[PDB]
Amino acid sequence: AVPIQPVAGAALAAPAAGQINQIDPWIFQNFVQCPLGEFSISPRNTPGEILFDLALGPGLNPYLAHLSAMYTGWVGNMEVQLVLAGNAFTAGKVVVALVPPYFPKGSLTTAQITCFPHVMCDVRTLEPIQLPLLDVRRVLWHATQDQEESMRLVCMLYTPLRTNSPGDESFVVSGRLLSKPAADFNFVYLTPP
Amino acid sequence: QDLVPAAVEQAVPIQPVAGAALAAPAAGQINQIDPWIFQNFVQCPLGEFSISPRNTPGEILFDLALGPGLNPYLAHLSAMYTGWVGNMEVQLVLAGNAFTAGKVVVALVPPYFPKGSLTTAQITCFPHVMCDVRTLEPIQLPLLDVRRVLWHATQDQEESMRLVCMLYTPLRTNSPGDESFVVSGRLLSKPAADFNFVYLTPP
Amino acid sequence: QDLVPAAVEQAVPIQPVAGAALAAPAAGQINQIDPWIFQNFVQCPLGEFSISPRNTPGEILFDLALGPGLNPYLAHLSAMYTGWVGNMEVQLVLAGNAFTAGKVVVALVPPYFPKGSLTTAQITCFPHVMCDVRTLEPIQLPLLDVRRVLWHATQDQEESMRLVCMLYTPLRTNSPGDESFVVSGRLLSKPAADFNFVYLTPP
Amino acid sequence: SGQDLVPAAVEQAVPIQPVAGAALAAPAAGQINQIDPWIFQNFVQCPLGEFSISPRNTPGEILFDLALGPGLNPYLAHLSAMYTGWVGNMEVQLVLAGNAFTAGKVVVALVPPYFPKGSLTTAQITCFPHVMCDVRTLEPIQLPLLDVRRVLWHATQDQEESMRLVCMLYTPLRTNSPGDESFVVSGRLLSKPAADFNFVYLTPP
């Protein structure tokens, strides 16, 4: 339950696009790993470390990035899930925020990361955490051969890791980020690659 | 038999512009503002200018831009939200004596208009208001939200409805007159009922 | 197609404030006053001021306070009663010629506002009225009874709705002009229909 | 995800009856003022909502003390620059998610106005409506902070006597770990306005 309205996908681009092209239905059935969507927490990290930050688009997917070479545009939401590898004796919390597609850049403290629509997940949670990546925008559709500003997913260390370690290693907790297109991801126009 | 009457004197006609109706299926949120900010004309952050008797007709006295920056209340709220879309309502006061003769014109220049140099002949071809310098009651105008995008980001480089004010006729006084007689002018503004921010962020 | 009109010129909007409706279950009595005191604007005990051509913009010309002390009739009645609660209605006249150019602003400053120093930029952010110095017909304002307590005691140290008047633009005359040309101003006031005293005591 | 913790931080009864918020201050204010409705949705961290509990702390150590007002919210502290007045209750979470080896208990009290500030011994903090909570509770302990008062509203001039919220360390923090390490629990504090929070009068920021 994150406080955001649903945002229209292909329902807004359709009157203006010339085609609206579907994706293989076997692509929505798999979670693939996002580039740079990996991190690790060591008990040496102080709260406030940006563990990752990555933007919405077709570059979050090995298949979508390859298919965007034929098409002119794209609209749609994505669907990301987060896996963490930690046992039952760890302690520490991570906040995942949904940064609007502006609000450019700076140092984000923990007092500020909780002011976005966010999910505050612990570190000893078993099941992968699901959340959406919404396509907030000011234009009707985006262009595949032009990287413009889109909504970003940001990860922050909210409460620091408190665990043990025999003598080695420092027992880092690893974290990975997987994604797949939501129901209303679409391309726009068939062009030659 | 149909009648003469001369008095019309105001009321630029407008066609209503869609506010968050266009933006809703695309913005993540659409945030209302306090309903009493719509009730008061308060002075812009940059709402000061003066007309000296030595200005030639055609010189642009001031030029604002439709945004959340023409209102002290909206400029304080805009720190939290990442966007805005809506209309404004502007009101200008001119403090002139009963011996200063002149007229200014206030026009609504669209976005994407070639940002060149406007003459006195072209200024009167936009939706405008003519107001002399002697008048006592403030005049006011609507500032609509003509735009090609759904909503605006709070980064003032983007083009929007500008508000230009030129000197239509030269400011001459029949008396000998000291040249240190500038005519003061102030700008005030409040959001029309179709204004709202977009997305909650930290300030 | 929707219309331009420029003329609004007055009428600060108000939300009605509860008079003795809040106070009744706590005051021992609630005393009406003569119904004809509501009919006449009469001059305050401290309703005199003047604007000299040598004052800079921002200087506070006068500052009254919502109470039974802005009315000669109420100030005579207040000797018998120990309290009051209600709204007022103020009317200011400015005796200016047709050659003096300037504008004053009249704002309604709430209680518990930090009693510092108000600029010309912050004065226009309270519910206000702009009035030039040449105008002939008197302007009037409502003075509401914003308060944290149920009723007020007739001991003027307590904070209530103040009424500030600043010089928005500097008073300049196009003619050479004698500096002994102060512009006179008077204040008048009468209780709005929601005023009444509280408890009968000896005068 | 081990469940040998104490997730028993369910809604407890605090001996206090509901309190009027903006309903009383409506006919004495001067205008209609409502605040954004998305502010009421998410819990965000207070401007002073971080603390820590070290095992070198003795029972009686005040972890935090804060008065009810707009200073408990980054969104409300920014809006409170334009207004002179506020009424209403607020809701606070308490994120004490210590390790599976710690031990200890804090007690959050609800101190009324006009109580003498300062010492507030540990024998006299259970005399108030209190919540006694462990340091291992997973789910964030929610609890209301109400606007008990004797005026119609509070000015945004912090000198008003408002209801406080004291967090004593009732018992000392200990660790049962097999060797050399005593974990320090880092507590956070989130808050959001209740359904009856409202500001009073518009003034320049």
Side-chain angles (χ1 to χ4, degrees):
Chain A
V2 311
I4 186 152
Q5 294 164 358
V7 289
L12 210 48
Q19 317 174 354
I20 296 291
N21 303 303
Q22 326 286 345
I23 307 170
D24 195 62
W26 286 101
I27 288 192
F28 311 93
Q29 316 292 150
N30 203 52
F31 269 104
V32 202
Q33 200 201 354
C34 303
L36 289 93
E38 58 209 289
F39 69 96
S40 92
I41 307 156
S42 43
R44 305 300 317 154
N45 294 6
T46 192
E49 299 297 330
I50 293 192
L51 300 164
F52 57 75
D53 178 349
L54 52 84
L56 174 64
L60 275 190
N61 222 3
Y63 302 110
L64 291 199
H66 185 251
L67 292 176
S68 45
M70 303 183 294
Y71 302 103
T72 308
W74 66 271
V75 282
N77 308 113
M78 291 280 283
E79 167 83 80
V80 306
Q81 87 163 1
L82 181 73
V83 308
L84 309 176
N87 60 339
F89 307 93
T90 314
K93 275 174 164 41
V94 160
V95 172
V96 181
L98 296 170
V99 172
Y102 287 117
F103 171 81
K105 261 316 190 195
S107 157
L108 270 181
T109 186
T110 75
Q112 288 188 330
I113 201 55
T114 45
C115 275
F116 291 106
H118 71 274
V119 178
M120 177 185 316
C121 41
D122 202 272
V123 73
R124 42 196 172 175
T125 76
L126 281 155
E127 309 78 358
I129 302 144
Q130 289 262 355
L131 70 158
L133 191 57
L134 285 302
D135 187 353
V136 187
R137 59 203 146 98
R138 321 180 315 164
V139 306
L140 271 60
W141 41 273
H142 299 271
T144 78
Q145 296 307 139
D146 170 20
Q147 181 259 8
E148 74 269 22
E149 174 76 89
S150 83
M151 166 163 293
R152 322 199 309 262
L153 191 84
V154 172
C155 207
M156 192 72 71
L157 183 57
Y158 191 57
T159 285
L161 205 65
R162 307 290 188 179
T163 174
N164 282 340
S165 279
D168 53 354
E169 291 78 353
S170 56
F171 185 69
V172 310
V173 68
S174 315
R176 306 287 198 265
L177 185 76
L178 301 164
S179 90
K180 80 181 170 183
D184 48 25
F185 201 99
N186 285 101
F187 286 109
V188 157
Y189 211 100
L190 270 183
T191 56
Chain B
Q1 192 252 308
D2 195 340
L3 213 46
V4 296
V8 163
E9 78 259 10
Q10 209 171 3
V12 53
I14 55 171
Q15 176 91 357
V17 187
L22 274 191
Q29 315 188 0
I30 287 280
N31 291 269
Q32 317 272 339
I33 71 173
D34 174 286
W36 273 88
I37 306 180
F38 304 74
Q39 308 284 325
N40 216 41
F41 276 119
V42 300
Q43 184 181 312
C44 318
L46 268 45
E48 65 271 13
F49 74 100
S50 316
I51 321 183
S52 84
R54 69 175 40 85
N55 287 317
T56 198
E59 318 197 41
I60 292 162
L61 309 171
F62 65 87
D63 161 79
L64 279 296
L66 172 85
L70 317 187
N71 206 21
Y73 286 118
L74 299 199
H76 186 246
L77 288 175
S78 89
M80 323 199 304
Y81 313 101
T82 195
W84 65 278
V85 54
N87 320 121
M88 290 286 292
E89 169 90 343
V90 181
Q91 182 196 23
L92 70 83
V93 301
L94 309 173
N97 203 275
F99 309 130
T100 178
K103 285 186 195 308
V104 311
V105 63
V106 197
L108 272 80
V109 175
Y112 299 103
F113 186 68
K115 269 156 156 175
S117 62
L118 271 194
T119 83
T120 41
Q122 306 173 21
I123 193 64
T124 181
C125 284
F126 301 97
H128 71 264
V129 190
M130 221 57 68
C131 50
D132 61 29
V133 286
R134 297 167 280 149
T135 180
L136 281 88
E137 314 99 346
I139 81 159
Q140 65 183 66
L141 282 75
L143 210 51
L144 302 175
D145 201 343
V146 187
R147 59 182 143 74
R148 311 188 319 167
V149 305
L150 305 175
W151 43 278
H152 292 115
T154 45
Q155 268 70 61
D156 318 316
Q157 67 291 339
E158 185 202 5
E159 190 148 27
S160 66
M161 207 89 192
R162 295 164 43 198
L163 179 62
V164 180
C165 173
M166 273 175 47
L167 183 72
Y168 203 48
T169 56
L171 195 148
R172 43 170 67 106
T173 319
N174 310 117
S175 71
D178 62 298
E179 271 314 316
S180 65
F181 194 29
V182 309
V183 191
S184 184
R186 308 276 185 264
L187 275 297
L188 295 84
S189 59
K190 70 171 168 191
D194 194 359
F195 190 91
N196 46 8
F197 286 113
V198 163
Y199 198 119
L200 258 186
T201 83
Chain C
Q1 192 252 308
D2 195 340
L3 213 46
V4 296
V8 163
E9 78 259 10
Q10 209 171 3
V12 53
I14 55 171
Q15 176 91 357
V17 187
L22 274 191
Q29 315 188 0
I30 287 280
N31 291 269
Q32 317 272 339
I33 71 173
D34 174 286
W36 273 88
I37 306 180
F38 304 74
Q39 308 284 325
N40 216 41
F41 276 119
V42 300
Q43 184 181 312
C44 318
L46 268 45
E48 65 271 13
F49 74 100
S50 316
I51 321 183
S52 84
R54 69 175 40 85
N55 287 317
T56 198
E59 318 197 41
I60 292 162
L61 309 171
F62 65 87
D63 161 79
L64 279 296
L66 172 85
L70 317 187
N71 206 21
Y73 286 118
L74 299 199
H76 186 246
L77 288 175
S78 89
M80 323 199 304
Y81 313 101
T82 195
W84 65 278
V85 54
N87 320 121
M88 290 286 292
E89 169 90 343
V90 181
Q91 182 196 23
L92 70 83
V93 301
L94 309 173
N97 203 275
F99 309 130
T100 178
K103 285 186 195 308
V104 311
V105 63
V106 197
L108 272 80
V109 175
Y112 298 103
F113 186 68
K115 269 156 156 175
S117 62
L118 271 194
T119 83
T120 41
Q122 306 173 21
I123 193 64
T124 181
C125 284
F126 301 97
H128 71 264
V129 190
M130 221 57 68
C131 50
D132 61 29
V133 286
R134 297 167 280 149
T135 180
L136 281 88
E137 314 99 346
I139 81 159
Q140 65 183 66
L141 282 75
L143 210 51
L144 302 175
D145 201 343
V146 187
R147 59 182 143 74
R148 311 188 319 167
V149 305
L150 305 175
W151 43 278
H152 292 115
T154 45
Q155 268 70 61
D156 318 316
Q157 67 291 339
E158 185 202 5
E159 190 148 27
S160 66
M161 207 89 192
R162 295 164 43 198
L163 179 62
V164 180
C165 173
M166 273 175 47
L167 183 72
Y168 203 48
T169 56
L171 195 148
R172 43 170 67 106
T173 319
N174 310 117
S175 71
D178 62 298
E179 271 314 316
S180 65
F181 194 29
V182 309
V183 192
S184 184
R186 308 276 185 264
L187 275 297
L188 295 84
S189 59
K190 70 171 168 191
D194 194 359
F195 190 91
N196 46 8
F197 286 113
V198 163
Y199 198 119
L200 258 186
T201 83
Chain D
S1 189
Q3 290 319 307
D4 45 21
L5 300 205
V6 174
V10 80
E11 191 268 329
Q12 274 66 238
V14 303
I16 187 172
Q17 71 191 7
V19 164
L24 304 197
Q31 50 203 78
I32 320 173
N33 289 313
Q34 288 96 22
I35 59 185
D36 190 60
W38 291 97
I39 310 284
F40 304 87
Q41 311 285 338
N42 49 350
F43 275 87
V44 310
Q45 170 181 139
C46 319
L48 282 150
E50 323 196 38
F51 60 87
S52 316
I53 304 152
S54 156
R56 297 296 92 203
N57 288 105
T58 57
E61 291 206 33
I62 290 189
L63 267 48
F64 60 90
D65 178 289
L66 47 87
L68 159 80
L72 292 192
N73 211 21
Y75 293 121
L76 295 187
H78 192 253
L79 285 181
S80 89
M82 308 162 56
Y83 299 103
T84 167
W86 60 273
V87 278
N89 323 126
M90 293 186 76
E91 326 186 338
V92 186
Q93 279 198 334
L94 191 51
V95 191
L96 304 161
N99 198 301
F101 289 101
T102 66
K105 273 172 168 44
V106 304
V107 66
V108 184
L110 259 173
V111 174
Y114 314 101
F115 202 63
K117 307 330 170 271
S119 159
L120 184 42
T121 68
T122 173
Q124 68 180 12
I125 199 170
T126 57
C127 292
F128 301 102
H130 69 265
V131 179
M132 194 160 318
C133 40
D134 195 280
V135 285
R136 301 173 283 152
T137 53
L138 273 171
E139 64 278 333
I141 310 145
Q142 302 228 19
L143 60 97
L145 160 73
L146 303 193
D147 192 24
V148 176
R149 66 198 187 281
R150 73 193 185 97
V151 289
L152 292 175
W153 78 73
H154 303 90
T156 47
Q157 308 301 128
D158 75 318
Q159 298 103 61
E160 64 270 338
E161 205 92 349
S162 158
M163 152 165 300
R164 279 181 291 152
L165 184 86
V166 189
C167 199
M168 201 82 74
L169 177 69
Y170 208 62
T171 83
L173 181 75
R174 292 290 173 263
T175 315
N176 197 1
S177 277
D180 293 289
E181 180 64 24
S182 276
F183 307 92
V184 168
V185 284
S186 174
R188 290 292 209 279
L189 202 77
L190 314 159
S191 91
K192 78 175 187 188
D196 49 323
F197 200 98
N198 209 6
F199 293 105
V200 161
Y201 200 96
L202 261 186
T203 80

